[PDB]
Amino acid sequence: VDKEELVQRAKLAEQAERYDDMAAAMKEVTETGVELSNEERNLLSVAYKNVVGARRSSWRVISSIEQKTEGSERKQQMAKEYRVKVEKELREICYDVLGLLDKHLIPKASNPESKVFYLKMKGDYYRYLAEVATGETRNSVVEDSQKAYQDAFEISKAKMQPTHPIRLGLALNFSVFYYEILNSPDKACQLAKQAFDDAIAELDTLNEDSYKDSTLIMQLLRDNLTLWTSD
Amino acid sequence: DKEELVQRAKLAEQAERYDDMAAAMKEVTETGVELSNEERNLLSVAYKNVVGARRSSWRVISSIEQKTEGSERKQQMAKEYRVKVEKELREICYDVLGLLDKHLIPKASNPESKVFYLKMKGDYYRYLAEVATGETRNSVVEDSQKAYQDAFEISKAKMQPTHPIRLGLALNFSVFYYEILNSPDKACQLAKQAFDDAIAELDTLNEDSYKDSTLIMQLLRDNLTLWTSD
Amino acid sequence: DWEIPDGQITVGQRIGSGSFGTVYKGKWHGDVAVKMLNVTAPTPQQLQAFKNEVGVLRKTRHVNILLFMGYSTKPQLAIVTQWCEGSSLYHHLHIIETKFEMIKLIDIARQTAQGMDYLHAKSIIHRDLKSNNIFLHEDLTVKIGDFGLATVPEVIRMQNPYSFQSDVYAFGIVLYELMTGQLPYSPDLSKVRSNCPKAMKRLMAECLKKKRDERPLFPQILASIELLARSLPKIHRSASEPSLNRAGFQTEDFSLYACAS
Amino acid sequence: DWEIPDGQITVGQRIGSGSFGTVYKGKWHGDVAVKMLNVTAPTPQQLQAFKNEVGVLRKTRHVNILLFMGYSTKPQLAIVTQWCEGSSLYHHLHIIETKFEMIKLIDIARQTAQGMDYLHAKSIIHRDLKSNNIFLHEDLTVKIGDFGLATVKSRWSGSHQFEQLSGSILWMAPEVIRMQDKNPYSFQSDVYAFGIVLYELMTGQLPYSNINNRDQIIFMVGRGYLSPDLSKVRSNCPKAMKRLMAECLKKKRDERPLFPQILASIELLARSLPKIHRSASEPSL
């Protein structure tokens, strides 16, 4: 079976901890992508979250250093010249991800659970592209994500659980949008508090493993909110 | 040009992207410098991390291929991936090795520094000797000790019996004999001849800075217990 | 001279009540604990029990001893200890039953036999040691505390029936408890340990004996455990000369205890 | 009486012998340290220095101060302190360059104040405070030592100068520049050295950065032309901690606040920020 040999080569490349040679071989199940099941769906998510996750974490350290100008030296343009060298493969590591979504995964997904998953991840890689955008690109890519987030809501408001962790994670994710892109904590506080209270209410009949990870993000909503009420 | 070229990898040091850190350091070495201790230290943190990222994936891939006794397809699925790291791992070291022997070891003049690359010279040979197989294994193992003993002899004509390069050579020397050659009888001989050479020193003075050297000295006594537990 | 004036101790929440007295979670210059006696009518034994008890704790100043801070009797009689940031050892092995590692499970048994050796050097009889007052600050160090009845098989025979050699009959029961994790009731044959030592099987057996005269003295229980430390292996693989910490600072950093230029 | 009889302490490795601190390593009852006299003969200044410092470490029992264990006098005058593993604060700032969170930047700044009042409630002048005499115990709780110039309330026994040769130029009071007949060390003159620590702690920089030597410094400490420029503060300094250090390192020596006040302000910052400045995202499984 051509599928399982393509997932076994990508189920051990994260166990061996080398994601770049998994990201370039986890996308290959989409080329024959009849139906992505959820048990290998998030295998693609863990890959692409960690591949760019090293770069943007490397990106923030370089921006922290370049604005530490020490007055203005005659060398830090090379720090700015090195700064572009991260941004060059920042744009080349995301374009396939959003690129492979709308071509294959979104126009085959029959369940709305998949539809909110793929559209959220569709919206996400503009956000990591929002802070690196820095110009008129900043005021063009974020509305693409905004409607991608806004398309993500209706399939989650109706047609999803009040405590589904993808829906809870979405408003968790989308709360982080508005502050460091659109600069409005009042939208951010008012978006977070609702689903925060909507899921603490009726914690009765859910099993504890769904209660487990959802508390790992509901408490992440608290430490997110307390930064916002402080400013 | 030259000093800013050092600054490129030093910027990448805290940036935690070691691959470009390694590529910047070899590029300044084309000129004949006899590089100082602010630059030659940077390659050891670089190239141990480029190797060690591959090597720590070798140690789990060679584990997980033996962790199953099932289908031969999934078994041969591991062996095709276990060579991709292995073919990667060798090509890193010759970049180091072909650099240092062609110009840098002949430019390694001073015996406070000429001992230092000779430590690193045979050390990557051991890295190949963990993985290289067949008659290729025997042709570097005999080249490891040949690249080790001509450094340990300079440790007799070296300056201080507590100098951390002289310690770290012996810690690299003894770890060879147990792991690769599999000679546990000569294993504890090198550590005892090196630890007790040092603990009898450091009695009059340690005015030279030495907190780096004492953590090497704890490492010597640490791994000796499992070497003696058999 | 550690009399502090009345009206200083912001007292707090009650931690346990029983035969020892009572304990609040105080706060004076950072959070402290206070061994309070709730009574106000001073019984003539506690006219005498209090004045000798602070005569004990006025001298002990060491790491593994729970640091004596202060005392007062003017609004009410109590003493001010330190406030360890952790649970007891009775807590770790019975209540929550936390499994541990053998390279450290005896490295608290170095540090309870370390700290009680400071007691006998000052010639202080503990007389009431159990596991229930062995405290673990930050889970790294081990503090000894709450030794109130402490005067500066004779207990279960009433044959004072206490000496230096009278707590080591109980000190074996401390280190036995680490091995098997269950309190007895001759706890020897149950000693199947993970690393399974022999000297620990010996030194447990060479303290809990019946013949009370031939109990071993204490500084050969520090020295015969520090010897046993170096034969329990620290690492599970060989190591190499690590990625060196070349940073410009390489000396031993003496400047806590002296000046710098 | 903790006069330690000779033979109990077992001296091991040397650590440092520079500016009068001949510190060593011991092994009595767990690892301890020992400071001994350099010369074999104590002069009338050396014996007086030991005969107050054995008393000033008698008087301090608090966790966030350096412990005291004993003193020996038969072979040479030794002082048995504690042995704190870890690293200094000055090494943590400008040598290893550890990027400190602003949460654990004040629990360092609280516990150097919540323990220094125990020197002031027991009325000790920590006469020579620097930013490197603070020390961390396994990087989580702090310990302060170096009582090498520590004095008690000395209105009953007069003292001479015995000063003006130290490395404490970057934390030096203007009263220290004056050197009056009344002793310029005071409780009010102690918070200024606490203040320049807090500037050097919070902004993560070295105090009085633009300085070639001490030629321009000491002219302008007590005159009114050198000042700690706290406006080069860090990116996230909350408004209380931004404001106390304004009135802390005052030039007016009586305007500076009392020490139980400067604990009482920083204990109000309990609810400040639970998490980091980075607002979190969804987790990776």
Side-chain angles (χ1 to χ4, degrees), chain A residues 11-69 71-73 75-158 160-179:
Chain A
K11 211 184 302 298
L12 55 91
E14 61 94 25
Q15 197 173 352
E17 203 264 328
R18 212 158 57 116
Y19 312 105
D20 179 37
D21 279 330
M22 175 183 57
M26 196 38 196
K27 72 160 79 163
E28 277 191 21
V29 69
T30 73
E31 317 308 285
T32 80
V34 196
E35 287 95 18
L36 262 289
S37 167
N38 315 312
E39 325 307 329
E40 83 277 355
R41 186 256 310 273
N42 53 74
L43 263 300
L44 180 54
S45 72
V46 173
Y48 270 130
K49 196 152 291 171
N50 296 311
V51 178
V52 68
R55 269 88 160 176
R56 55 187 294 240
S57 61
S58 299
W59 152 251
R60 262 188 271 117
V61 183
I62 302 185
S63 275
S64 318
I65 287 162
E66 203 273 326
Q67 309 290 343
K68 286 277 286 301
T69 78
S72 287
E73 67 179 14
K75 193 168 298 177
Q76 70 168 307
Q77 73 280 3
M78 176 72 105
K80 251 184 177 186
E81 278 168 54
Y82 192 82
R83 187 174 186 174
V84 188
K85 306 303 197 174
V86 189
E87 304 178 297
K88 209 172 203 182
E89 49 96 12
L90 262 167
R91 308 190 188 105
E92 289 149 348
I93 197 61
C94 55
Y95 280 171
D96 41 354
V97 198
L98 50 91
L100 65 94
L101 274 156
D102 48 353
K103 293 173 195 164
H104 305 277
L105 310 166
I106 308 168
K108 198 38 175 297
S110 61
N111 269 321
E113 287 75 20
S114 49
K115 295 168 212 173
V116 59
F117 205 114
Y118 301 136
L119 278 159
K120 175 223 290 191
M121 198 196 312
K122 167 66 158 67
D124 275 26
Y125 289 94
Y126 300 104
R127 310 206 291 103
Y128 318 95
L129 254 282
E131 290 102 8
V132 78
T134 77
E136 67 95 15
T137 42
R138 166 69 135 172
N139 47 76
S140 49
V141 307
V142 305
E143 50 268 60
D144 299 311
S145 54
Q146 177 173 358
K147 58 185 62 61
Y149 275 118
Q150 275 183 177
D151 280 279
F153 272 117
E154 170 59 41
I155 292 99
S156 48
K157 285 172 184 176
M160 211 50 236
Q161 289 178 291
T163 173
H164 198 241
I166 313 295
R167 182 191 86 94
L168 303 174
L170 166 69
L172 174 62
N173 208 334
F174 195 40
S175 310
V176 202
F177 194 104
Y178 277 142
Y179 192 82

Side-chain angles (χ1 to χ4, degrees), chain D residues 203-209 217-222 224 227-229 235-238 240 244 246 248-250 256-261:
Chain D
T203 200
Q205 293 289 107
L206 67 161
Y208 291 143
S209 313
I217 309 181
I218 322 171
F219 278 179
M220 300 157 36
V221 174
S227 312
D229 269 296
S235 45
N236 186 16
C237 321
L244 64 97
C248 197
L249 45 101
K250 204 91 181 180
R256 299 164 172 165
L258 270 298
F259 213 86
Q261 296 302 108

Side-chain angles (χ1 to χ4, degrees), chain C residues 85-157 160-178 180-190 197-233:
Chain C
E85 302 91 308
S87 64
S88 91
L89 195 138
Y90 199 94
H91 210 267
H92 269 277
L93 312 177
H94 292 335
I95 300 172
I96 73 180
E97 206 263 330
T98 291
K99 316 300 294 171
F100 231 97
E101 192 88 1
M102 194 70 59
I103 75 170
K104 182 151 157 101
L105 190 146
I106 74 166
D107 212 53
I108 67 179
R110 182 176 80 90
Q111 277 158 340
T112 171
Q114 174 63 265
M116 216 176 314
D117 193 79
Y118 196 82
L119 289 191
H120 292 51
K122 291 304 179 184
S123 52
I124 304 177
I125 316 295
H126 195 286
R127 267 170 187 190
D128 44 19
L129 188 82
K130 281 302 286 205
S131 157
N132 48 10
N133 53 69
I134 317 293
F135 293 155
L136 290 97
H137 159 85
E138 289 308 288
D139 316 287
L140 307 168
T141 326
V142 164
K143 311 295 189 95
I144 310 165
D146 205 8
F147 38 95
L149 204 146
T151 315
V152 56
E154 290 181 354
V155 186
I156 45 184
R157 218 193 90 180
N160 297 327
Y162 312 95
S163 314
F164 289 171
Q165 306 204 320
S166 314
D167 48 23
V168 297
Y169 156 68
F171 184 74
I173 317 193
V174 166
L175 52 92
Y176 165 68
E177 185 53 279
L178 304 174
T180 51
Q182 265 170 4
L183 174 83
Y185 309 108
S186 156
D188 171 80
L189 65 94
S190 318
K198 188 65 97 186
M200 192 45 67
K201 185 61 167 297
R202 217 47 62 84
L203 199 136
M204 177 197 61
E206 297 150 321
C207 302
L208 88 180
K209 299 193 177 179
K210 188 249 170 193
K211 276 288 297 164
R212 195 253 171 182
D213 45 355
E214 47 98 26
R215 305 207 174 279
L217 261 173
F218 222 73
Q220 67 258 39
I221 311 299
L222 155 73
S224 164
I225 289 183
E226 191 162 313
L227 167 70
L228 186 48
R230 316 189 207 90
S231 167
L232 183 60

Side-chain angles (χ1 to χ4, degrees), chain A residues 184-200:
Chain A
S184 157
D186 49 350
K187 288 169 223 164
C189 81
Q190 86 198 353
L191 189 56
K193 282 181 146 290
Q194 302 168 359
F196 192 72
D197 301 323
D198 287 0
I200 296 166

Side-chain angles (χ1 to χ4, degrees), chain C residues 30-77:
Chain C
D31 297 16
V32 308
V34 280
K35 276 266 303 170
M36 53 155 52
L37 262 295
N38 212 328
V39 314
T40 172
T43 169
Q45 287 311 303
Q46 95 181 4
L47 272 76
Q48 303 179 0
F50 188 89
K51 307 281 181 171
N52 61 70
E53 189 269 344
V54 189
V56 190
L57 277 82
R58 206 205 165 101
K59 291 264 195 156
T60 79
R61 281 157 97 261
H62 194 210
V63 186
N64 286 110
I65 322 290
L66 195 48
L67 171 74
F68 173 78
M69 296 272 318
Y71 87 112
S72 296
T73 192
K74 304 79 187 170
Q76 203 182 12
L77 79 172

Side-chain angles (χ1 to χ4, degrees), chain D residues 77-89:
Chain D
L77 295 198
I79 302 101
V80 183
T81 88
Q82 214 194 3
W83 170 247
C84 188
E85 77 266 42
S87 293
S88 155
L89 195 70

